Amino acid sequence: SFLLSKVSFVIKKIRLEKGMTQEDLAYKSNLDRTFISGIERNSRNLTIKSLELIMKGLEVSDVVFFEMLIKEILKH
Amino acid sequence: MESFLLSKVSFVIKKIRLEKGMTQEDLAYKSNLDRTFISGIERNSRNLTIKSLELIMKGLEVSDVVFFEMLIKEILKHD
Ligand code: NA
């Protein structure tokens, strides 16, 4: 999945710019650590509702997240 | 309450579907997904995976970028 790889990269990019570890993000998203780790290794098929929990955990605005996603897609 | 992003994703799928002249059944046929899953999405009653969204975008003949532009606009126009 090309789009899953891009969404996963943006997640990681924002997590790392905020200084959060995977455990920090798991906790704030109310998701399991091993699920966050799986997403970032591009090895898990994320839903829209889980994506929203991750955006809330990151405290990133929905519009900003999708602008970043578009930028990353356009690199290709 | 219900997921904001899910309701907006759902709404953009329906909007594009109708702009292309397609029925729910048509979109199911072209996405290779069950018609009852299409219908559930649009009634804001079904979550979907990123990979199902990609199949829907292929059924809609819309690029990822155009889909996300439309999503951004619909989020902005919500108050
Ligand atoms: Na839905």
Author numbering:
A (entry chain D): 3 to 78
B (entry chain A): 1 to 79
Paper text:
Flexibility in this loop is very important for DNA sequence recognition, as it has been observed in the nucleoprotein structures to adopt different conformations depending on which operator site the protein is bound to.
Of the mutant proteins, Y37F showed the strongest binding to the OM site, followed by S52A and Y37A. SPR analysis showed that Y37F formed much more stable complexes with the OM operator site than Y37A, with KDs of 1.8 and 5.5 nM respectively, but both were less stable than the wild type (KD = 0.51 nM). This indicated that the role of the tyrosine was more than just the formation of a hydrogen bond with the DNA backbone, but also involved the phenyl ring common to both tyrosine and phenylalanine. The free protein structures of the wild type, Y37F and Y37A mutants showed no major structural differences either in the local binding regions in terms of helix or side chain positions, or in the overall fold. The Y37F crystal structure has six monomers (three biological dimers) in the asymmetric unit. Five of the monomers in the asymmetric unit are observed to be in loop conformation I but the sixth more closely resembles that of conformation II, which is almost identical to that in the DNA-protein complex with the 19OM operator site. Despite Y37F and T36A only crystallising in the presence of SO4, this anion was not visible in either electron density map. As with the high-resolution wild type structure, the C-terminal tail is also involved in several crystal contacts with multiple monomers in the T36A, Y37F and trigonal R46A structures.
